[PDB]
Amino acid sequence: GGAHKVRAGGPGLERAEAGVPAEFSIWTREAGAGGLAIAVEGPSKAEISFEDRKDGSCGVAYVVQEPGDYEVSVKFNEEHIPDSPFVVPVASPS
Amino acid sequence: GGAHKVRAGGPGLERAEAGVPAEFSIWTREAGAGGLAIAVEGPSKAEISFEDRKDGSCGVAYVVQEPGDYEVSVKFNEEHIPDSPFVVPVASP
Amino acid sequence: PLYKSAITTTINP
Amino acid sequence: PLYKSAITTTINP
Ligand SMILES: *SC[C@H](NC(=O)CC[C@@H](N)C(=O)O)C(=O)NCC(=O)O
Ligand SMILES: *SC[C@H](NC(=O)CC[C@@H](N)C(=O)O)C(=O)NCC(=O)O
């Protein structure tokens, strides 16, 4: 286990725009060893990558192609972390 | 089940090549109503699409980036059809 | 990393 | 259609 020791936060968990990279961070320092899985589900395909953060958290960026409501899940050892899944409204680009 | 009335078959359930569209067909005619889910899981990102085939089956094409073994899932109403997941060895071109 | 892509369509007679 | 994408990595202390 250890999912309860993981926290995720950032703009990409609150709102996104179609085609614009949406970014958030995952606090992993306390969780120990395990599989950290990020998933995006919704009306269009998503591309997800892991990134560096200065603060030592694990950075995530994703891009979706169409507006709509998407669900972003973050699981650790196949267990939802607190507040996952996140419902993220994705708007047409401004 | 209902997923037990679904069948899938084609080169893309047997073997694939990185960068090369891998194709198979799903016979859906007698599962009735429901959600047909195809998934590709493995060492790189997969692009997946559907085509309505002229023979009346549901066509599927996928492309993956890297060689390795991939699991191709075909589920009907969250249940694996017979022989799913398909383990597909993927060669480099 | 392990990657998964999935696509779900609704079948309706 | 409904689309899902996932990526999974290993964390090691
Ligand atoms: S987002 C990739 C992820 N990174 C982290 O959890 C950041 C860990 C941090 N202390 C650092 O500066 O590396 C990851 O895959 N981590 C690799 C690992 O072995 O934990
Ligand atoms: S591959 C998309 C899928 N098509 C089929 O299952 C083949 C349908 C076939 N009888 C035809 O030639 O139309 C699909 O999403 N079909 C729509 C549906 O509700 O059946």
Coordinates of all heavy atoms in Angstrom, one line a residue, chain A residues 13-47:
Chain A
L13 N -4.9 19.7 -12.2 CA -5.9 18.9 -11.5 C -7.1 19.8 -11.3 O -8.1 19.2 -10.7 CB -5.3 18.4 -10.2 CG -4.3 17.2 -10.5 CD1 -3.7 16.8 -9.1 CD2 -4.8 16.0 -11.2
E14 N -7.1 21.0 -11.7 CA -8.2 22.0 -11.5 C -8.9 22.3 -12.8 O -10.1 22.3 -12.8 CB -7.7 23.2 -10.8 CG -6.9 23.0 -9.6 CD -6.2 24.2 -9.0 OE1 -5.8 25.1 -9.7 OE2 -6.2 24.2 -7.7
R15 N -8.1 22.6 -13.8 CA -8.6 23.0 -15.1 C -7.6 22.8 -16.2 O -6.4 22.9 -15.9 CB -9.1 24.5 -15.1 CG -8.2 25.4 -14.4 CD -7.8 26.6 -15.2 NE -6.8 27.5 -14.6 CZ -5.5 27.2 -14.3 NH1 -5.0 26.0 -14.7 NH2 -4.7 28.1 -13.7
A16 N -8.0 22.6 -17.5 CA -7.1 22.6 -18.6 C -7.8 23.2 -19.8 O -9.0 23.5 -19.8 CB -6.7 21.1 -18.8
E17 N -7.0 23.4 -20.9 CA -7.5 23.8 -22.1 C -7.1 22.7 -23.2 O -6.0 22.2 -23.0 CB -6.9 25.1 -22.5 CG -7.3 26.2 -21.6 CD -6.8 27.6 -22.1 OE1 -5.6 27.7 -22.5 OE2 -7.6 28.6 -22.1
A18 N -7.9 22.5 -24.1 CA -7.7 21.5 -25.1 C -6.4 21.9 -25.8 O -6.2 23.1 -26.3 CB -8.9 21.5 -26.1
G19 N -5.5 20.9 -25.9 CA -4.2 21.1 -26.7 C -3.1 21.8 -26.0 O -2.0 22.0 -26.5
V20 N -3.4 22.3 -24.7 CA -2.4 23.0 -23.9 C -1.9 22.1 -22.8 O -2.8 21.5 -22.1 CB -3.1 24.3 -23.3 CG1 -2.1 25.1 -22.4 CG2 -3.5 25.3 -24.4
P21 N -0.6 21.9 -22.6 CA -0.1 21.0 -21.5 C -0.7 21.5 -20.2 O -0.5 22.6 -19.8 CB 1.4 21.2 -21.6 CG 1.7 21.5 -23.1 CD 0.5 22.5 -23.4
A22 N -1.2 20.5 -19.4 CA -1.7 20.7 -18.1 C -0.8 20.0 -17.1 O -0.5 18.9 -17.3 CB -3.2 20.2 -18.0
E23 N -0.4 20.7 -16.1 CA 0.7 20.3 -15.2 C 0.3 20.2 -13.8 O -0.5 21.0 -13.3 CB 1.9 21.3 -15.3 CG 2.5 21.4 -16.7 CD 3.4 22.6 -17.0 OE1 3.3 23.6 -16.2 OE2 4.1 22.6 -18.0
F24 N 0.8 19.1 -13.1 CA 0.6 19.0 -11.6 C 1.8 18.3 -11.0 O 2.7 17.9 -11.7 CB -0.8 18.3 -11.3 CG -0.9 16.9 -11.8 CD1 -0.7 15.8 -11.0 CD2 -1.4 16.7 -13.1 CE1 -0.9 14.5 -11.4 CE2 -1.6 15.4 -13.5 CZ -1.4 14.3 -12.7
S25 N 1.8 18.2 -9.7 CA 2.9 17.6 -9.0 C 2.3 16.5 -8.0 O 1.2 16.5 -7.5 CB 3.7 18.6 -8.2 OG 4.2 19.6 -9.1
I26 N 3.2 15.5 -7.8 CA 2.9 14.4 -6.9 C 3.9 14.2 -5.9 O 5.1 14.0 -6.2 CB 2.6 13.1 -7.7 CG1 1.6 13.2 -8.8 CG2 2.2 12.0 -6.7 CD1 1.5 12.0 -9.7
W27 N 3.5 14.4 -4.6 CA 4.4 14.2 -3.4 C 4.5 12.7 -3.1 O 3.6 12.1 -2.7 CB 3.8 15.0 -2.2 CG 4.8 15.2 -1.1 CD1 5.1 14.3 -0.1 CD2 5.8 16.2 -1.0 NE1 6.1 14.8 0.7 CE2 6.6 15.9 0.1 CE3 6.1 17.4 -1.7 CZ2 7.6 16.8 0.6 CZ3 7.1 18.2 -1.3 CH2 7.9 17.9 -0.2
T28 N 5.7 12.2 -3.4 CA 6.0 10.8 -3.3 C 7.0 10.4 -2.2 O 7.1 9.2 -1.9 CB 6.7 10.3 -4.7 OG1 7.9 11.0 -4.9 CG2 5.7 10.4 -5.9
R29 N 7.7 11.4 -1.6 CA 8.8 11.2 -0.6 C 8.4 10.2 0.5 O 9.3 9.5 1.1 CB 9.2 12.5 -0.1 CG 10.6 12.6 0.6 CD 10.9 14.0 1.2 NE 11.7 14.9 0.3 CZ 11.3 15.5 -0.8 NH1 10.1 15.5 -1.2 NH2 12.2 16.3 -1.4
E30 N 7.1 10.2 0.9 CA 6.7 9.5 2.1 C 6.1 8.1 1.9 O 5.9 7.3 2.8 CB 5.6 10.3 2.8 CG 6.1 11.2 3.9 CD 5.7 12.6 3.7 OE1 4.6 12.9 3.2 OE2 6.6 13.5 3.9
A31 N 5.9 7.8 0.6 CA 5.1 6.6 0.2 C 5.9 5.3 0.2 O 5.3 4.2 0.1 CB 4.6 6.9 -1.2
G32 N 7.2 5.4 0.2 CA 8.1 4.2 0.0 C 8.1 3.7 -1.4 O 8.0 4.5 -2.4
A33 N 8.4 2.4 -1.6 CA 8.5 1.8 -2.9 C 7.2 1.4 -3.4 O 6.3 0.9 -2.7 CB 9.5 0.6 -2.8
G34 N 6.9 1.6 -4.7 CA 5.7 1.2 -5.3 C 5.5 1.7 -6.8 O 6.3 2.4 -7.3
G35 N 4.4 1.3 -7.4 CA 4.0 1.6 -8.7 C 3.1 2.8 -8.7 O 2.0 2.8 -8.1
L36 N 3.6 3.9 -9.4 CA 2.8 5.2 -9.4 C 2.2 5.3 -10.8 O 2.9 5.5 -11.8 CB 3.7 6.3 -9.0 CG 3.1 7.7 -9.1 CD1 2.1 7.9 -8.0 CD2 4.2 8.8 -9.2
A37 N 0.9 5.2 -10.9 CA 0.2 5.2 -12.1 C -0.7 6.4 -12.3 O -1.5 6.7 -11.4 CB -0.7 3.9 -12.2
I38 N -0.6 7.1 -13.4 CA -1.4 8.3 -13.7 C -2.3 7.9 -15.0 O -1.8 7.4 -15.9 CB -0.6 9.6 -14.1 CG1 0.1 10.1 -12.8 CG2 -1.5 10.7 -14.5 CD1 1.4 9.6 -12.6
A39 N -3.6 8.3 -14.9 CA -4.4 8.0 -16.0 C -5.4 9.1 -16.3 O -5.8 9.8 -15.4 CB -5.2 6.7 -15.7
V40 N -5.7 9.3 -17.6 CA -6.6 10.4 -18.0 C -7.7 9.7 -18.9 O -7.3 9.0 -19.8 CB -5.9 11.5 -18.8 CG1 -6.8 12.6 -19.4 CG2 -4.7 12.1 -18.0
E41 N -8.9 10.0 -18.5 CA -10.0 9.3 -19.2 C -11.0 10.4 -19.6 O -11.3 11.4 -18.8 CB -10.7 8.3 -18.3 CG -11.7 7.5 -19.1 CD -12.5 6.5 -18.2 OE1 -13.2 7.0 -17.2 OE2 -12.5 5.3 -18.5
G42 N -11.5 10.3 -20.9 CA -12.5 11.3 -21.4 C -12.7 11.2 -22.8 O -12.3 10.2 -23.5
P43 N -13.4 12.3 -23.4 CA -13.8 12.2 -24.8 C -12.7 12.2 -25.9 O -13.0 11.9 -27.0 CB -14.7 13.5 -25.0 CG -14.2 14.4 -23.8 CD -13.8 13.5 -22.7
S44 N -11.5 12.4 -25.5 CA -10.4 12.4 -26.5 C -9.1 11.8 -25.9 O -9.0 11.8 -24.6 CB -10.1 13.7 -27.1 OG -9.4 14.6 -26.3
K45 N -8.2 11.4 -26.8 CA -7.0 10.8 -26.4 C -6.1 11.8 -25.6 O -6.2 13.1 -25.8 CB -6.2 10.4 -27.7 CG -7.0 9.4 -28.6 CD -6.2 8.9 -29.8 CE -7.1 8.3 -30.8 NZ -6.3 7.5 -31.8
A46 N -5.3 11.3 -24.7 CA -4.4 12.0 -23.9 C -3.0 11.5 -24.0 O -2.8 10.3 -24.2 CB -4.8 12.0 -22.4
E47 N -2.1 12.4 -23.9 CA -0.6 12.1 -23.9 C -0.1 12.6 -22.5 O -0.3 13.7 -22.1 CB 0.1 12.8 -25.0 CG -0.5 12.4 -26.3 CD 0.6 12.2 -27.3 OE1 1.6 12.9 -27.2 OE2 0.5 11.3 -28.2

